RNA sequence: CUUUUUUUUUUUUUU
């Protein structure tokens, strides 16, 4: 039996008086009996014990609590915003009712009436033990330990790719359905679409320039293009061109409401959930080569060291000549003084030659190198962990093998100019409208648990400092490197260092009072926004509208500073849910590859020792498994610590008794060899020492 | 009714 809620007027009175504290609930996955909300001060988080004192609140919901008299303990007394999707995936069992158990251990256990269950489930239920179901919570009583739910549908067989993919898509709230006819009725009509003739005067015509895009090979939507031209005085004219999406998305139409509802596109291993209809996403706005397109552009005149001497914003019309990749661009970067033959090059428009593209990407790389060096001298921080990419089968969709996604120079050449374009646009739209502008901000990391990393790195002979961000980056660069063990050292230390960092936020400039909170911590800039990808995000469409209002092409936005804050608040959770969905898609496909590729042999580094287990990080792939002594064939094992440094001694079992048993020493940053083997569970495997 | 063990894994760029 729980406790009833209190009135909204009493919530407001006690929240203004100061007896109640609001905050976002976080629920421990490994032990569901405890919950945490962040403190408004910042000293230590607020504890909520039990399931009863959580009071029907779910993970991610923004609740209001009251502290018990005496870590400080509180109980949930009200819920303002229900931020959880209230849906789950799981299994149906039997005990008037039937039991539903979700896979997630934070979601409670659900009663479903047998009217919702299918017609042959009550008799012979043995075949419905590996069937995935989607169930939605609709009501939870004050006197029931179990929620009441409605069964949506049957997903499929548990352990497959598409039932689990659609289940994890549905559990986070990603709308992966199709667009209604009231959305496609706002699209432009006429299959051979052409540019209207009144737009040859309000936009600048750059059809004769050398214009190119550099994008991955498995990409159908293109959001940006680049151009470089050498001047006659040793300078460069560099132009960045962004697809004009806001011309095709008017304000107030249902297309704009749908694009604001699904605030971003979700990219998975096998497919993509878009933001716009396929016409706008793939033909009209996506800058395919050999076609005239309407863009919105920023053009600079830069020195060879990359210093701004001129700036011009404005709407233009381009015609791209080629579509390069990240592999051809590396070929022309790494062949500076040799003509690459045309057999290994993509097709190009006949108006231009490959010499122009070759010298253009050489000049852009030359500017981008100096921009990188100046940005990291200035104090930018970059904590890059390891990401892997799979190779699929064209007839069944199963993975064949995974490789390591390498961050080459062509991913930096684009990134420097995109950061330059965002840095220009943020300054322009902040000096134009100081009370309505959409910008990003990164808070400084938490002071409480950065100190724990300080006392951890005080030991173990590691000379790092966390006084700033550029100091942290220069310390992680200039301590160890260029080895086979030092790179694993770098990976384990980066994995520990990325834990106290906060998450970046969209915000409106008319609600924060001081300019200290406008700062972006990791790039070390005072102003930042997103502008260069309007097909993938809706915040860039908002920035396009604001900058077109700032340039005098249209009237000022008629939206309040609270509407922009609400839209940014929606975009933040949409981005977070999208990132979580791609993480689980990567985990799903790796588990499928492990099960269908036998045991996998790799090396690992120990990053944590417990009494009966220790945690490794697999170097070849990038996952963090746990190894238990119960699965080991040892004679004995002993745990020691001296100077707060853990120590594990393993005494193995010899194959013959006429020989002294071997010894194994396990401490932090130790290189071991492991093998990954799937087990009888559908989506589970284990790591075992070899 | 629920895991072979105390929460926080982030930033940037392109898909």
List, in sequence order, every residue forming a beta bridge with A396; answer none if it has no partner.
Answer: none
| Residue A667, both tokens | 């401490």
Domain final residue pick, A21, A50, A81: A81
Q: Cα–Cα distance between A224 and A236 in angstroms, integer?
A: 19
Could you give the C-alpha distances from A25 to A47, A55, A490, in angstroms and in order?
A: 10, 12, 33
Cβ–Cβ < 8 Å for A180, A294: no
* Residue A4 CB partners (closer than 8 Å, separation 6+): A142
Q: 3-state DSSP call for residue A659? A: coil
Nearest C-alpha neighbor of A419 from the set A524, A263, A573: A524
Helix (H, G, I), strand (E, B) or coil at A567: helix
Give me the torsion for CA of A551, A553, A556, A559, rounded to 10°.
-110
Residue pointed to by tokens 């005072």: A526
* C-alpha span between A270 and A429 (Å, rounded): 38
Q: State which of A172, A191, A221 marks the end of a domain.
A: A172
Cα A286 off chain centre by: 23
Q: For residues A674 and A599, is the Cβ–Cβ distance under 8 A?
A: no
Alpha-carbon separation of residue A511 from A110, A521, A551, A606 (angstroms): 42, 19, 24, 46
- Angle (CA) A31-A36-A39 rounded to 5° is 160
Report whether A77 contacts A20 (CB < 8 A).
yes
* Same structural domain, A462 and A534: no
User: In this structure, is residue A578 part of a structural domain?
Assistant: yes
Q: How far is the CA of A587 from the C1' of B5 (A)?
A: 23
DSSP class per residue in A419-464 = HHHHHHHHHHHHHH-SSS-EEEEBPPPPHHHHHHHHHHHHTTT---
Give, rounded to a whole angstrom, the gap between the first and last alpha carbons of chain A. Answer: 51
Nearest to A685 by CA among A582, A596, A584: A596
Q: How far is CA A550 from the centre of its chain?
A: 31
Does one domain contain both A640 and A552? no
Separation of alpha carbons A79 and A62, rounded Å: 6
| Residue bearing tokens 């646009």 | A425
Nearest to A220 by CA among A292, A283, A295: A283
Q: Which residue is nearest to nucleotide B6 (CA to C1')?
A: A31
Q: At what angle do helices A447-458 and A486-497 cross, to 10 degrees?
A: 150
Distance, Å, A164 CA → B7 C1': 26
Judge whether A272 and A340 are in contact, CB under 8 Å. Answer: no
For residues A438 and A542, the answer to whether their CB atoms sit within 8 Å is: yes
Q: How many distinct structural domains can be found in chain A?
A: 5
Q: What is the CATH number of the domain that holds A651?
A: 2.40.50.140
- Through-space separation of residue A49 CA and nucleotide B6 C1' in angstroms: 12
Q: Are residues A56 and A29 in the same domain?
A: yes
3-state helix, strand, coil in chain A (%, to 5): 25, 30, 45
* CA A689/CA A381 separation, integer angstroms: 36
Strands A292-302 and A308-319: antiparallel
Distance of A74 CA from B7 C1′ (whole Å): 16
Buried b (16+ CB within 10 A) or exposed e, A431-470: eebeebbbbbbbeebbeeeeeebeeebeeeeeebebeebe
Provide CB contacts within 8 A for A107, sequence distance 6+. Answer: A58, A59, A88
Q: For residues A319 and A380, is the Cβ–Cβ distance under 8 A? A: no
Q: Which nucleotide is nearest to A30 (CA to C1')?
A: B3
Residue A423 sits in the same domain as residue A310? yes
Whether A605 and A483 share a structural domain: no
A453 and A431 in a common domain: no
The answer to whether residue A69 sits within a structural domain is yes
Q: Supply the DSSP symbol for A318.
A: E
Tokens of A375: 């940005």
Q: Which residue is nearest to nucleotide B12 (CA to C1')?
A: A382
Cα dihedral A659/A665/A670/A674 (nearest 10): 50
When computed from its CA atoms, the radius of gyration of chain A, rounded to whole angstroms, is 28
Q: Which residue has the tokens 């939870």?
A: A140
Whole-number Å distance, CA A562 to C1' B11?
A: 27
Helix or strand run (H / E) with residue A645: none
Cβ pair A425, A298 in contact under 8 A: yes
Does A302 lie in the same domain as A168? no
Give Cα separations from A91 to A103, A123, A504 (angstroms).
8, 17, 36
- Alpha carbon A277 to its chain centroid, in Å, reads 23
* Torsion A566-A572-A578-A580 (CA) sign: negative
List, in sequence order, every residue forming a beta bridge with A133; answer none if it has no partner. A90, A154
* A143: Cβ contacts below 8 Å, ≥ 6 apart: A1, A2
Closest by CA position to A117, among listed A150, A148, A157: A150
Tell me if A215 is assigned to a ligand binding site: yes
Q: Which residue is nearest to nucleotide B4 (CA to C1')?
A: A628
- Residue A206's beta-bridge partner residues? A318
List all residues 6 or more positions away from A140 whose beta carbon is below 8 Å from its beta carbon.
A56, A147, A148
A453 Cβ contact list (under 8 Å, min separation 6): A466, A496, A497, A499, A500
CA–C1' gap, A4 and B11, in angstroms? 42
Q: Domain with A120 in it: what CATH number?
A: 2.40.50.700
In a domain, A12, yes or no: yes
Nearest residue to A538 via CA among A355, A274, A205 = A274
The spacing between the Cα labelled CA in A144 and the C1' in B7, in angstroms, equals 27
Interatomic CA distance for residues A651 and A65, integer angstroms: 51
Nucleotide nearest to A220 (CA to C1'): B15
Q: Which nucleotide is closest, CA of A267 to its C1'?
A: B15
Please list, residue by residue across A35-45, b when 16 or more beta carbons sit within 10 angstroms of its beta carbon and e when fewer do: bbbeeeeeeeb
Minimum-distance nucleotide, CA of A71 to C1'? B6
Same domain for A450 and A335, yes or no, is: no
In a 10 Å sphere around its CB, with 0-12 CB exposed, 13-18 middle and 19+ buried, how is residue A569 labelled? middle
Nucleotide nearest A536 (Cα, C1'): B15
How many Å does it take to go from CA A455 to C1' B5? 24
Please give the Cα distance from A453 to A575 (Å, whole number): 28
Residue A202 lies in a domain: no
Provide the resolution (angstroms).
Answer: 3.1
- Alpha carbon distances (Å) from A226 to A191, A220, A234, A316, A413: 28, 17, 20, 13, 11
Q: CA geometry: angle at A243 spanning A425 and A525, to 5°?
A: 25
- SS3 at position A132: strand
Q: For residue A17, how many other CB atoms are within 10 A of its CB?
A: 8
In the complex, which nucleotide's C1' lies nearest to the CA atom of residue A630? B4
Residue A224 annotated as binding? Answer: yes
Give A398-403's long-range contacts (Cβ < 8 A, gap of 24+).
Answer: A398/A161, A398/A592, A398/A596, A399/A589, A399/A592, A399/A593, A399/A596, A401/A593, A401/A597, A402/A590, A402/A593, A402/A621
Which run of H or E residues covers position A52?
none
> What is the Cα–Cα distance from A307 to A300, expressed in whole angstroms?
9
Tell me if A611 sits within 8 A of A625, measured CB to CB.
Answer: no
A157 lies in the same domain as A281: no
The answer to whether A162 and A170 are in contact (CB under 8 A) is no
Burial class (CB within 10 angstroms; exposed 0-12, middle 13-18, buried 19+) of A298: buried
Neighbours of A211 (CB within 10 A): 26
Distance CA A589, CA A368 (A): 35
A147 lies in a domain? yes
The domain boundary, picked from A61, A81, A101, lies at A81
φ/ψ of residue A599, rounded to 5: -70, 140
Residue A507 maps to a domain:
no
Instruction: Report the distance separating Cα A320 and Cα A317, nearest Å.
Output: 10
- Protein CA A509 to sugar C1' B10 (Å): 24
Q: Is residue A140 part of a domain?
A: yes
**Given the DSSP bridges, would you call strands A110-112 and A147-157 parallel, antiparallel or unpaired?**
parallel
Give the phi and the psi of residue A462 in degrees, each rounded to 5: -120, 115
For nucleotide B7, the protein residue with its alpha carbon nearest to C1' is: A28
Nucleotides of chain B touched by protein CB (<7 A): 1-15
- The structure was resolved experimentally with cryo-EM
**A212-214 and A322-324 beta bridge pairing:** parallel
Structure tokens at A478: 């200039």
| Domain CATH for A44 | 2.40.50.690
Parallel, antiparallel or unpaired: strands A308-319 and A322-324: unpaired
| Closest alpha carbon to C1' of B13, residue | A415
- Amino acid whose CA is nearest the C1' of B9: A499
A22 lies in which domain range? 8-81
* Residue A540 maps to a domain: yes
Among all strands, which nt has the closest C1' to A684 (CA)?
B3
> Both A605 and A580 in a single domain?
no
My answer on whether A410 and A551 are in the same domain is: yes
Backbone φ and ψ for A216, nearest 5 degrees, come out as: -65, 160
Q: Are residues A71 and A137 in the same domain?
A: no
Q: Distance between CA atoms of A444 and A313, rounded to whole angstroms? A: 32
DSSP β-bridge partners for residue A608 = A615
Mode of pairing for the β-strands spanning A646-652 and A438-441: unpaired
CA dist A8 → A56, A79, A95, A98, A204 (Å): 17, 10, 38, 35, 56
């Amino acid at each position: 039996i729980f406790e009833t809620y209190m009135s909204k007027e009493d919530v407001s009175e006690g929240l203004k008086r100061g007896t109640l504290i609001q905050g976002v609930l976080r629920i421990n996955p490994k032990k569901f009996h405890e919950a945490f909300i962040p403190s408004p001060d910042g000293d230590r988080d607020i504890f909520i014990d039990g399931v009863v004192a959580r009071n029907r609140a779910l993970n991610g919901d923004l609740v209001v609590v009251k502290l018990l008299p005496e870590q400080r303990s509180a109980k949930v007394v009200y819920i303002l915003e229900k931020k959880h999707s209230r849906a789950a995936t799981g299994f149906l069992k039997l005990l008037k009712y039937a039991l539903f158990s979700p896979s997630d251990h934070r979601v409670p256990r659900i009663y479903v009436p047998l009217k919702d269950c299918p017609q042959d489930f009550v008799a012979r239920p043995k075949d419905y033990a590996n069937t995935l179901f989607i169930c939605r919570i609709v009501d939870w009583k004050e006197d029931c330990n179990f929620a009441l739910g409605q069964l949506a549908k049957s997903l499929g067989q548990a352990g497959e790719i598409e039932p689990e993919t659609e289940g994890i898509l549905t559990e986070y709230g990603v709308d992966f359905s199709d667009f209604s006819s009231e959305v496609l009725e706002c699209l432009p009509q006429g299959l051979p679409w052409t540019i209207p003739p009144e737009e040859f005067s309000k936009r600048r015509d750059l059809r004769k320039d050398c214009i190119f895009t550099i994008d991955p090979s498995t990409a159908r939507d293109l959001n940006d293009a680049l151009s470089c031209k050498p001047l006659a005085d040793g300078n460069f004219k560099v132009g960045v061109h962004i697809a004009d999406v806001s011309y095709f998305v008017p304000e107030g139409s249902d297309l704009d409401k749908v694009a604001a509802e699904r605030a971003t596109s979700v990219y998975l291993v096998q497919k993509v959930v878009p933001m716009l209809p396929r016409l706008l996403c793939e033909e009209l706005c996506s800058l395919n080569p050999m076609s005239d397109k309407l863009t919105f552009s920023v053009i600079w005149t830069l020195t060879p060291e990359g210093k701004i001497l001129d700036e011009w914003f404005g709407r233009t019309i381009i015609r791209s000549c080629t579509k390069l990749s990240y592999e051809h661009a590396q070929s022309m970067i790494e062949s500076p003084t040799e003509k690459i033959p045309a057999k290994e090059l993509p097709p190009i428009s006949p108006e231009h030659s490959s010499e122009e593209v070759h010298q253009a990407v050489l000049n852009l790389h030359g500017i981008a190198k100096q921009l990188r060096q100046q940005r990291f001298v200035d104090g930018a921080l970059r904590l890059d962990q390891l990401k892997l990419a799979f190779t699929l089968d064209h007839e069944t969709g199963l993975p064949q093998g995974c490789h390591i996604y390498e961050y080459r120079e062509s991913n930096k050449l684009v990134e420097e100019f995109m950061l330059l374009a965002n840095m220009a646009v943020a300054h322009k739209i902040h000096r134009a409208f100081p009370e309505q502008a959409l910008l990003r901000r990164h808070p400084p990391p938490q002071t409480r648990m950065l100190s724990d990393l300080v006392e951890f790195c005080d030991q173990m002979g590691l000379p790092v400092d966390f006084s700033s961000a550029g100091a942290l980056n220069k310390s992680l660069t200039q301590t160890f490197g260029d080895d086979k063990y030092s790179l694993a050292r770098k990976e384990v230390l980066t994995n520990m260092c990325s834990r106290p960092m906060q998450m970046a936020l969209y915000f409106c400039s008319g609600l924060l009072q001081d300019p200290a909170q406008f700062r972006h911590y990791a790039l070390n800039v005072p102003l930042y926004t997103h502008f260069t990808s309007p097909i993938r995000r809706f915040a860039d469409v908002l920035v396009h509208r604001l900058l077109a209002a700032a340039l005098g092409y249209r009237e000022r936005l008629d939206m309040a500073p609270d509407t922009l804050q609400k839209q940014a608040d929606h975009c933040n959770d949409r981005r977070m849910a999208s990132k979580r969905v791609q993480e689980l898609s990567t985990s799903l496909f790796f588990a499928v590859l492990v099960k269908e590729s036998g045991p996998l042999e790799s090396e690992a580094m120990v990053m944590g020792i417990l009494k009966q287990a220790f945690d490794v990080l697999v170097l070849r792939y990038g996952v963090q498994k746990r190894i238990y002594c119960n699965a080991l064939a040892l004679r004995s094992h002993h745990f020691q610590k001296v100077g707060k440094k853990p120590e594990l001694t393993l005494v193995w079992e010899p194959e013959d008794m006429e020989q002294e048993p071997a010894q194994q020493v396990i401490t932090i940053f130790s290189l071991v060899e492991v093998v990954l083997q799937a087990e009888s569970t559908a989506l589970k495997y284990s790591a075992i020492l070899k």
